[PDB]
């Protein structure tokens, strides 16, 4: 009931840029293995145990941030259901540490080598240290997404990555069948150490704000070709395809003649002998037939795509000089004809795109049949190992293979042009594309002439301008009345709509934004030249009401970087003297001693209370009667209207129920059972007209941030940590997850719109540790068992398809105590159900604001050489004070209270009470207060 404070460390994370995974028809390998060694560790630096964990991570969900986050902060590997780690004593997953009976049983130390192996066929991650295997293994985890090696660490630790054989050498031999991680590097990119995700970067001029980064998916490695052999083109196959085959034979033999290749009646590659050595290909030859399959397949693919085949002036092709001779041909060969159709008709851009897609399809089909054979991808070719470095999709292929597969198709397309072909060419992810940066709301200005600058390092989609303090993180910049912004990617001024203005920018050009609150004007200057409107007005916007104030704001698209210069140093301000200096405009934050703190829209979904003014949803608190318990009903305001939105809804209750520390076993209702029971009841009623197949009823853990709009019961996170003895037989097997629900369609399958409402009850036991489900008084086959010291929130996921959807009923059954006793200590023995004001329904929200730290960890990474591999080191301490919310089991920065005006007031009154209780010489309580607020916190 009171916010906690403590000092924590900053923990960062580094990956090796190797993404692996599996799917149906993928070209990747299902077994991997890598090595990390430790050089320097300084324990207990800055009065806190040094963080150091090595393991794997998932691209989809593992997105740590420099702030506090879940738990008490300092999240690393294993503090989420998307990563699994190993610190020396325990295996980390889901922020739970389970000790492992390793041979060494000691924390990570200098001169320690850790080998990690991953199996995707049967999902399993195993670790070993200095050749000694650990007893515990992770199993049965979700295979969605791609896996990459990862290390999390605080300051004062130096490590080296033995990635395969090219970069470092393995201290111990890999287990059989486990490929080194150096083999999974894509042909387009080289090996490079990098952080997982970031919203800023160090640059020459200063910090560069970066936006979202595009990431590959596990389904991007599969080939998806088009069945072109089904389509047949007899009118071309009769004559046109043999004309194409004739010229292909011409070019083929031209290649041999240009090469050292000699003429010989029998094929002798040793003496370079030409098996045919005839100018006109002998048609009965099965090789000539296979060239007929050449032409046939090419025409079939052309017709299968959007191309329209046809003949236009083939007599013109016959009329031009087709028999172009170089007089260098071998005396066995005849006059090799060169049509030279390029001079008559060059390849159009559309034509070269057609060549590109034809080559892409031709490579995709081959990749598909190689996958059918059972080949895989490797950085080094190994024919006996069924590894090919060229079976990646055509998009992932390098340009050398592209041109090698493109040259012959370019010649064929030139022949087609010469013959005269008439071929003619034919919710959650939204937040992951745009990141918004803005200044703190304490810097709002309501008067004067202010100026700041922005630099577009990468030509792309960014929007720079001024915004209101109320500006929401979900909405795009300028889509509402809360932002006057300029988009230089297309040259559009944006405020409650988009209108053309100015011109698009380039890379490296600086745009200066100037606001004049005396004249109510906004001016955008590109490289010192004022951008011009179509009408002929220098002001982008005018007649602007001051209102509550304005703040600088900028938004960046995917893979974009930008340099924002508020103007703390005038010497670093460009074009300010050109425009703004003599016009009475001052740089933003000119006399400020410290740099301006900025806020960014973090994309981590979290549960927030349902606002009372929400236009689409309304929650009613219905009281209890003689035969009905208290209940919270959900309704749709805008149902059955043109301007209505229907989507998946994730709702929970604001208060949790916590299990016992130790599981010590354990009509007219009998009082001994009433005051000796431990089970609790909680029901959900789905109204008539709402499909039972679109509701999920159960419980959730405090760590649930999955906002997938196509939620299925098979998309929930789940892992099993298995601890075995030395002999290998497992003695422990613990399941971990974050969502224990059932599906309403299961009860309705056994049996359109039904009149009867569906009541589903969830029985919980806080002593045994199990929860069961019942439907309409009928026992179900679904049971769940959980570990002690676990707190769960009741929750429902619903797809609204009716005016009235769901009702949270909070009552009691026979010999069963209601949820009020479980939630509240003061009512622990009250059989009468009740709903105090604290109990409330909360909805999942995708985006929220967050505060960027003032200082960041300085991590230095390089490569020592092939003997030592890549090296990572960090040695600068960095701490922060965290504020912890007890019930939600999550913390936040103490400096974030500058905008949270309610928690700040509550904490100030808490401090006042702290002084009051120990006031007037109560030393016995002053001593006790030290365990809550300590000397280090006070000095900090």
């Amino acid at each position: 009931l009171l916010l906690q404070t403590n000092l924590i460390n900053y923990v960062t994370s580094i990956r090796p840029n190797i993404f692996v995974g599996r799917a149906e028809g993928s070209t990747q390998y299902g077994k991997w293995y890598f090595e990390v060694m430790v050089d320097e560790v300084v324990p207990f630096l800055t009065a806190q145990a040094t963080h150091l964990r090595v393991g794997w991570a998932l691209t989809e969900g593992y997105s740590p941030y420099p702030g506090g986050g879940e738990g008490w902060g300092g999240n690393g590997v294993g503090d989420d259901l998307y990563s699994y780690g190993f610190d020396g004593l325990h295996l980390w997953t889901g922020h739970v540490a389970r000790p492992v009976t390793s041979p060494g049983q000691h924390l990570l130390a200098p001169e320690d080598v850790v080998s990690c192996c991953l199996d995707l066929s049967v999902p399993s991650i195993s670790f070993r240290i200095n050749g000694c295997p650990v007893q515990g293994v992770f199993e049965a985890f979700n295979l969605d997404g791609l896996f990459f090696p990862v290390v999390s660490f605080s300051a004062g630790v130096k490590v080296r990555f033995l990635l395969g054989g090219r970069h470092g050498e393995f201290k111990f031999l890999p287990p059989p069948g486990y490929a080194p991680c150096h083999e999974a590097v894509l042909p387009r990119e080289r090996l490079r150490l990098e952080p997982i995700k970031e919203y800023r970067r160090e640059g020459p001029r200063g910090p560069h704000l970066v936006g979202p980064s595009r990431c590959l998916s596990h389904t991007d490695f599969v080939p998806c070709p088009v069945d072109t052999v089904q389509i047949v083109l007899p009118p071309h196959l009769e004559r046109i395809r043999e004309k194409l085959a004739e010229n292909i034979h011409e070019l083929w033999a031209l290649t041999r003649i240009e090469q050292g290749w000699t003429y010989g009646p029998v094929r002798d590659d040793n003496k370079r002998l030409h098996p045919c050595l005839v100018n006109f290909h002998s048609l009965p030859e099965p090789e000539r037939n296979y060239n007929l399959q050449m032409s046939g397949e090419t025409l079939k693919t052309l017709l299968a795509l959007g191309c329209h085949v046809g003949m236009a002036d083939e007599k013109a092709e016959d009329n031009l000089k087709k028999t172009k001779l170089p007089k260098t041909y071998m005396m066995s060969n005849g006059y090799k004809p060169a049509p030279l159709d390029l001079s008559h008709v060059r390849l159009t851009p559309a034509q070269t795109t057609l060549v590109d897609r034809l080559a892409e399809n031709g490579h995709n089909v081959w990749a598909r049949d190689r996958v059918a054979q059972g080949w895989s991808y490797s950085a080094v070719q190994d024919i006996p190992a069924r590894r090919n470095p060229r079976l990646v999709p055509y998009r992932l292929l390098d340009e050398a293979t592209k041109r090698s597969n493109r040259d012959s198709l370019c010649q064929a397309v030139r022949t087609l042009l010469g013959y005269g072909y008439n071929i003619e060419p034919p919710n959650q992810s939204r937040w992951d594309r745009v990141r918004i940066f803005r200044a703190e709301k304490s810097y709002t200005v309501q008067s004067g002439r202010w100026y700041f600058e922005f630099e577009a390092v990468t030509t792309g989609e960014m929007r720079v301008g001024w915004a209101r303090p109320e500006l929401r993180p979900d909405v795009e910049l300028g889509a509402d009345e809360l932002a006057y912004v300029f988009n230089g990617h297309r040259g559009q001024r944006w405020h409650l709509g988009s209108e053309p203005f100015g011109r698009p920018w380039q890379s490296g050009d600086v745009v200066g934004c100037m606001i004049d609150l005396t004249e109510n004007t906004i001016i955008f200057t590109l490289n010192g030249e004022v951008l011009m409107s179509d009408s002929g007005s220098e002001t982008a916007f005018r007649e602007i009401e001051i209102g509550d104030g304005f703040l600088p704001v900028c938004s960046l698209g995917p893979g974009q970087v930008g340099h924002l210069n508020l103007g703390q140093d005038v010497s670093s301000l460009r074009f300010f003297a050109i425009c703004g200096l003599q016009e009475g405009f001052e740089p933003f934050a000119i006399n400020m001693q410290r740099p301006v703190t900025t806020w960014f829209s973090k994309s981590l979904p979290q549960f927030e209370p349902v606002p009372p003014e929400h236009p689409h949803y309304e929650v009613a608190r219905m009281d209890g009667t003689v035969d009905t318990p208290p209940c919270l009903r959900l309704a749709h305001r805008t149902w059955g209207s043109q301007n209505s939105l229907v989507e998946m809804l994730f709702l929970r209750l604001s208060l949790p129920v916590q299990f016992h520390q130790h599981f010590r076993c354990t009509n007219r209702d009998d009082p001994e059972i009433i005051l000796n029971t431990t089970t609790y009841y909680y029901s959900v009623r789905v109204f008539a007209g709402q499909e039972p197949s679109c509701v999920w009823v159960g419980w959730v853990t405090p760590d649930y941030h999955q906002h997938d709009m196509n939620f299925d019961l098979s998309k929930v996170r789940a892992v099993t940590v298995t601890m075995g003895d030395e002999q290998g037989n497992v003695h422990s097997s613990l399941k971990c997850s974050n969502c224990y629900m059932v599906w309403g369609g299961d009860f309705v399958s056994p049996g359109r719109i039904s009149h009867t409402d569906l009541v589903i009850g969830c029985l919980v036991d806080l002593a045994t540790g199990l929860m069961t489900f019942t439907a309409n008084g009928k026992e179900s086959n679904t049971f769940f068992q959980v570990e002690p010291n676990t707190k769960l929130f009741p929750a429902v996921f619903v797809l609204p398809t009716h005016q009235n959807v769901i009702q949270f009923e909070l009552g009691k059954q026979k010999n069963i105590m209601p949820l009020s006793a479980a939630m509240f200590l003061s009512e622990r023995k009250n059989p009468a159900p009740q709903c105090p004001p604290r109990l409330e329904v909360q909805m999942l929200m995708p985006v929220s604001w967050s505060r960027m730290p003032n200082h960041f960890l300085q991590v230095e990474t390089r490569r020592a050489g092939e003997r030592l591999g890549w090296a990572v080191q960090c040695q600068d301490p960095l701490t922060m004070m965290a504020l912890h919310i007890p019930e939600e089991n999550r913390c936040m920065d103490i400096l974030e209270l500058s905008e949270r005006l309610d928690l700040q007031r509550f904490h100030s009154h808490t401090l006042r009470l702290y002084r009051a209780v120990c006031a007037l010489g109560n030393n016995r309580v002053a001593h006790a207060l030290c365990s809550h607020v300590d000397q280090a916190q006070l000095l900090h």
Epitope: H249, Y290, M294, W366, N388, S404, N405, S408
Partner: nanobody, 126 residues
């Protein structure tokens, strides 16, 4: 998917006769020039004489001795007979078939990579 099952190349003394039967089972398209590769243990891989549809054989430097290679395209079978065993002829022998005919490809890299490498056998000379 076309699989080449090859059986033969038994271990006998020098001068013996070895019969190797290779059968390609799979798709009906692109079955030409199905031939033989050899690889000595710890040595480079070489190409043995490869027969093509129409009874055309492409020879190399390792065809020395008494070789005879015949094929039937009705069942995609090859009956390779060796009568000259040499101590340097001990190797793993693989039977490989592909769309490429007479060791030529008018496409380039794609069809070159377009090979159907089946299982192989062991050839040992005392």
């Amino acid at each position: 998917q076309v699989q080449l099952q090859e059986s033969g190349g038994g271990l006998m003394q020098a001068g013996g006769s070895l019969r190797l039967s290779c059968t390609a089972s799979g798709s009906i398209f692109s079955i030409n020039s199905m031939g033989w590769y050899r690889q000595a243990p710890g040595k480079q891989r070489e190409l043995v004489a490869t027969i093509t549809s129409g009874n055309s054989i492409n020879y190399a430097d390792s065809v020395k001795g008494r070789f005879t290679i015949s094929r039937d395209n009705a069942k995609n079978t090859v009956y390779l007979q060796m009568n000259s065993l040499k101590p340097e002829d001990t190797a793993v022998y693989y039977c490989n078939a592909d769309r490429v005919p007479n060791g030529y490809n008018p496409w380039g890299t794609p069809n070159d990579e377009y090979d159907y490498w089946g299982q192989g056998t062991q050839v040992t000379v005392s």
